[PDB]
Amino acid sequence: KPKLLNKFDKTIKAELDAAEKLRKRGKIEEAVNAFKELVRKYPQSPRARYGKAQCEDDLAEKRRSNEVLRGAIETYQEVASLPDVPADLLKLSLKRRSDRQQFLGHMRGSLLTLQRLVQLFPNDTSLKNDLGVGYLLIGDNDNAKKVYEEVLSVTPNDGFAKVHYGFILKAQNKIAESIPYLKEGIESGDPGTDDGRFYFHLGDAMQRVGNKEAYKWYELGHKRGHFASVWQRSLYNVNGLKAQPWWTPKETGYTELVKSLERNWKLIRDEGLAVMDKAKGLFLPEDENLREKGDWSQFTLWQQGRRNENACKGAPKTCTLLEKFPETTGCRRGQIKYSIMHPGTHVWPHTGPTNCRLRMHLGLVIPKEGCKIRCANETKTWEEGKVLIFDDSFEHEVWQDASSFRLIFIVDVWHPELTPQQRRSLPAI
């Protein structure tokens, strides 16, 4: 189908075919040298240059070497720099380039390739959709939003642009507005729309506006394999981990950590209170749009398995105590943090991102009335000097209707069935 041979490349199609046949038979090493020979002899040939790059690409895949793949990325760029490149080849070369840049984590590099692709092919709507992803991946929601607005303005039924626009709107807290976009985009069935992120945020936006259909989408997201279940809707998962909303200390196996938290709770409390009194700016407001209303801030000692050294200056004994428990200080998918919540607070139903952690809550200052946490189908209260443990990958919700502040300490641990190499390898969240 695709037209990849310019005028000169048609005159050497026998050589080009022989080189490509070696690659398709898995003789990567022979293929690389055959295309390098063709690039040497025919230095302007775009098909020879694309062959070289595709061979490096295959070679990176066979060796699982990022080094080899970075080489292919530049060769894909070389293709686009040659004269008289056929349009289909130009687009394949630069698209593969962007995709391999994203695979390596070079999101700003991928973005630049995508910008170029859209300038070279201004009527390809799919490339604009891909450019919007480029922007989302570097955190540029403002430009992503304009890209999908542009897409919808000429192809208003594009399902991919709809779900992504709906995702952006929801992230901006434009909750009612996001719902039709997310819903119509998933229903479009277009490639790229069957994605757990859109099921997740569509049901969430519905819950926030009181729409009872929310769990219809959770159930369809479960049926289509995005959620472990209707209640456990995390998206960065190791499958097979024991899934249970509430855990006892003995079920986790972290009995020494729990004992240390409980036996030394007043010290943990008092350092948090001192920071409240004298260094309150260390407490940062929660910034993930999780509150319906009220005041909630957190003072973080560890995130992504990394100690915040300045923060630990405010809780030095607590940080020293925690250093003996790598199951939390090395939990690169969790945090260690104080959490203060004041009256009039309601945290929406929500789920954390990963089933790879469990969350311990140690009560520090707990009003006698008004504070409770629901996880799935079971609601509990905190107690001063006592640890609660739940799996925040299950939907959970919190209320604060006391007459004074509530202070807890949150200690995240690796899910206990995760192996040592799993704990060393999983990307941090």
Partner: peptide
């Protein structure tokens, strides 16, 4: 932005190839 208590970012991880 990082995914601490929620799933609000488009992606929560920063991948590194193979």
């Amino acid at each position: 932005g990082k995914c601490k208590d929620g799933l609000g970012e488009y992606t929560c991880t920063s991948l590194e190839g193979f």
